[PDB]
Design a protein around this nucleic acid. Structure first.
Lengths: 108, 98, 105, 93, 79, 93, 84, 98
DNA sequence: ATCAATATCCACCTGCAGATTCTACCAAAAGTGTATTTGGAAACTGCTCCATCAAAAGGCATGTTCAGCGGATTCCGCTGAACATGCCTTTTGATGGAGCAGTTTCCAAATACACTTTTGGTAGAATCTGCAGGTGGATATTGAT
DNA sequence: ATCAATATCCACCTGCAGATTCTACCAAAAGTGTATTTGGAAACTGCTCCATCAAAAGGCATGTTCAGCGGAATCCGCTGAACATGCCTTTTGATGGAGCAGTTTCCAAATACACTTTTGGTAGAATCTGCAGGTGGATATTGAT
């Protein structure tokens, strides 16, 4: 007489059930193994976790406690694998990494 | 008197805007550009507030990126002044070349 | 009976195209018109390339179209070149073209 | 049995030019071509329907797709044929 | 005179954010040209979505989708 | 209505940064992220299934999908994280 | 079973030279040859890593041209003339 | 004794190889390189001849493309000799640099 | 180095635009029972992939010789950056007004679905020919004198 | 400017690999008769987009002065192009062995419905604060001297 969220069963925070609904809404005749939405729910949470991890650290370095788009671009554009995973992506109001080519530097 | 040497304010401008994230094109003017272009495809159109923001965000990010590649092409040529042909090469190599 | 292709007045296979639309699970349902239209388009684009390649073949005084002809046909036509921009044609080669500054005096 | 567009491409080939032939290597490309576009259009069409919460790919989706995918002039003639065909079809019975 | 509204000061700001130090005078109009083609391409597809949807209103999504298919995925407007 | 991953993005965030919060726009970006990767993975998956004439998208596909889409290290952990969650989902009552 | 090693060096200067000529290059820096092998090597490890993933996904011991064709596509480099 | 000036033969080749379509790399040497890489990835693999052929068609077209972009970069710097830094600019603008 | 004009960073404080949290319908995920499909299992056929081999000529490798390219150095005309100046225009915050997205709900045309009948492709085989490879010779290009 | 050295353009020759018909098996198109249901159509509500208005301070255009950069020109050190030589290794082509890719069929583990009960997720209203923005003095940076 009790209910149990598959997400809880998977030990994950992301919508396992919702994922399955979504995998179906977007890929018709394909049947979907119960494993599918759990495996993915987990993978997205992981990548989400990974981004927030560094976004924060970036928010911190900015003397701030509130993550904003900037903190995400910084966290992404400075990290090799994420910046790779996100080529072709534009983060609204994320700016650009601070970078000036030495040829353009004053001289000193 | 006082006066900053050529290229100092620019380096300062670079360091500045490269630290910020606000848009750099004037909103109104942009919105007018959008609707102007949009017309030639479909008359009596209605843009959402967001669909214009998104449009501009994309555009500025696009140009900011294109300028980075263009800067590389100038530097490649022993220069530091970006000229039109740096933009051409950059876009040519990109695959855009329009 | 009459073949749906014949009915749409087409050479390309409407039923086949229809079937593939299904196997490919692009969606749930497929309008009786979709495979006709698509089939029609594919046949058209086919005709186009075939047209320019044929010419290209004959230009090179050849009776049989080979890959280099599709290559030349495609790379010399602004639009087809754009549509097949990220494409590479095995044994097609390239448009002959030498940068001007590389030529002598 | 492996199916392909060979006979269909060949038919169209004979209309554009009667006295020309095609190498098997060239027919290969032709096949790859037809299959690629078939994919591009069906796919674009697919998304299109889903963006619009629709469950059916109709001649209408296919057209927008053709519009989104093809170069202006190629697009125009593309859409003529499309319509010309669907229209004719819708009366041949 | 839309596409002049995109002023030299702005373009310079852009290029600056792009790490640019000097700028040919001709750059301005040139960038101006490039930006036009950019919007023509994305708006055309955007409007095409709006059209297919039987609408008279270009939505943020129309743009997002148009951008996507141009290879330029954009975040923060899927809301 | 209008759903999102907003709330989960949040849990995850707090679960590792109790003393840190995330702005509106910032959250929208994370939302886009999840929707994109989700799509890329779902896209590769059904595609693997198709090529292999299979009619079921399973965790096996998602995995391969993951391997095909993510840079090495990042891919490593996602494969783990995935199999991990599927294992616990299977055993765990 | 003869161990394979340093086969990149098989991509010889004469060859890297013909490719560049078809690419329309008239003058080649001496450091280009090695530079090119490096670039070639990356391209191949990439296409092959994906192809084989496809191979392994289908529990097969043979790398088929379709594996390569699908691989080249994930990378945006569509190839005609091998589609099964 | 006869002898052509430097470049005369080079342009000769450019014309030659741009008119033809045959693969420019030796088949066998290429097959090994491919098997080497594949093996140093997953052992006990077999290759249909076409896959190897597919890989070479793809590998050679890619480099010929790279060389054109590389050639444009050198000309941009008022040079006619492609140099590593030339290949480098082109790959970066291409987004390859990984 | 020594000012001196100035930009820049950091200490410091507080109202509130915007994030956080509370709150109570409710759409959709979890649940039990039943119906339908599948993709791994297994014996198995046969394509093709691997490894040889032997002959040898096309093609790589090495060395040399010097043409001309790349780059360094010098020279200046003039294109753009810095800065003051007069001011047109973008920005800004609340407004009633309607075009027009997005909902609910009824239903006819269109799809799906399960057989049966008919036939348009395909694989294989007999058969027609376009052209790759060689031989030759008049012609165009190049480079020396 | 004329001419020897060579690569190039190329019409003819023709045997044979690869292309083009020639025909019957078989999935698979194509009719028909139910069975199911999308999504356009019609009535309707309210979430938003276009707008009229009107200040004001924030930027844009203008124009003057010249710093120094881009670009032309002279030059020579040496890096690559051409090339003659030497002989290895890729290429070619026929040949057997066997792993393995692919077809087929028996089957239980698994996904797909159809339907009911229990929340998990969301909207928007009630509560809350991170920090944008303003002030100010210390210090760093730039540049003429």
């Amino acid at each position: 007489s009790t209910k149990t969220s598959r997400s809880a069963k998977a030990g994950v925070i992301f919508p396992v059930g919702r994922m399955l609904r979504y995998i179906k809404k977007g890929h018709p005749k394909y049947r979907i193994g119960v494993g599918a939405p759990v495996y993915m729910a987990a993978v997205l949470e992981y990548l989400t976790a990974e981004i927030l991890e560094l976004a924060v650290n970036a928010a911190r370095d900015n003397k701030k406690g509130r993550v904003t788009p900037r903190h995400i671009l910084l966290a992404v554009a400075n990290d090799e694998e994420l910046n790779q995973l996100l080529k072709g992506v534009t983060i609204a109001s994320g700016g650009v990494l601070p970078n000036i080519h030495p040829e353009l530097l004053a001289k000193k | 008197p006082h006066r900053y040497r050529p290229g100092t304010v620019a380096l300062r401008e670079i360091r500045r805007y490269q630290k910020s994230t606000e848009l750099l094109i004037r909103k109104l003017p942009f919105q007018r550009l959008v609707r102007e272009i949009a017309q030639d495809f479909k008359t009596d159109l209605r843009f959402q507030s967001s669909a214009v923001m998104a449009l501009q965000e994309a555009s500025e990010a696009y140009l900011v990126g294109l300028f980075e590649d263009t800067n590389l092409c100038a530097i490649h040529a022993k220069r530091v002044t970006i000229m039109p042909k740096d933009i051409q090469l950059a876009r040519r190599i990109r695959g855009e070349r329009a | 009976a009459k073949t749906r292709s014949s009915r749409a007045g087409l050479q390309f296979p409407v039923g086949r195209v229809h079937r593939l639309l299904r196997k490919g699970n692009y969606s749930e349902r497929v309008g009786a018109g979709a495979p006709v239209y698509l089939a029609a388009v594919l046949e058209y684009l086919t005709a186009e390339i075939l047209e320019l390649a044929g010419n290209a073949a004959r230009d090179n005084k050849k009776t049989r179209i080979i890959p280099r002809h599709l290559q030349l046909a495609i790379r010399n036509d602004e639009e087809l070149n754009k549509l097949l921009g990220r494409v590479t044609i095995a044994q097609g080669g390239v448009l002959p073209n030498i940068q001007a500054v590389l030529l002598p005096k | 049995r492996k199916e392909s567009y060979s006979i269909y491409v060949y038919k169209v080939l004979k209309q554009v030019h009667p006295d020309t032939g095609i190498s098997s290597k060239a027919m290969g490309i032709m096949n790859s071509f037809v299959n690629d576009i078939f994919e591009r259009i069906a796919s674009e069409a697919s998304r299109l329907a889903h963006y619009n919460k629709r469950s059916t790919i109709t001649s209408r989706e296919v057209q927008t797709a053709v519009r989104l995918l093809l170069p202006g002039e190629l697009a125009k003639h593309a859409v003529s044929e499309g319509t010309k065909a669907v229209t004719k079809y819708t009366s041949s019975k | 005179d839309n596409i002049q509204g995109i002023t030299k000061p702005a373009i310079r700001r852009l290029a600056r954010r792009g790490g640019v130090k000097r700028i040919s005078g001709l750059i301005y109009e040139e960038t101006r040209g490039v930006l036009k083609v950019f919007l023509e391409n994305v708006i055309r597809d955007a409007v095409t979505y709006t059209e297919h949807a039987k609408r008279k209103t270009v939505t943020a999504m129309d743009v997002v989708y148009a951008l996507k298919r141009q290879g330029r995925t954009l975040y923060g407007f899927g809301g």
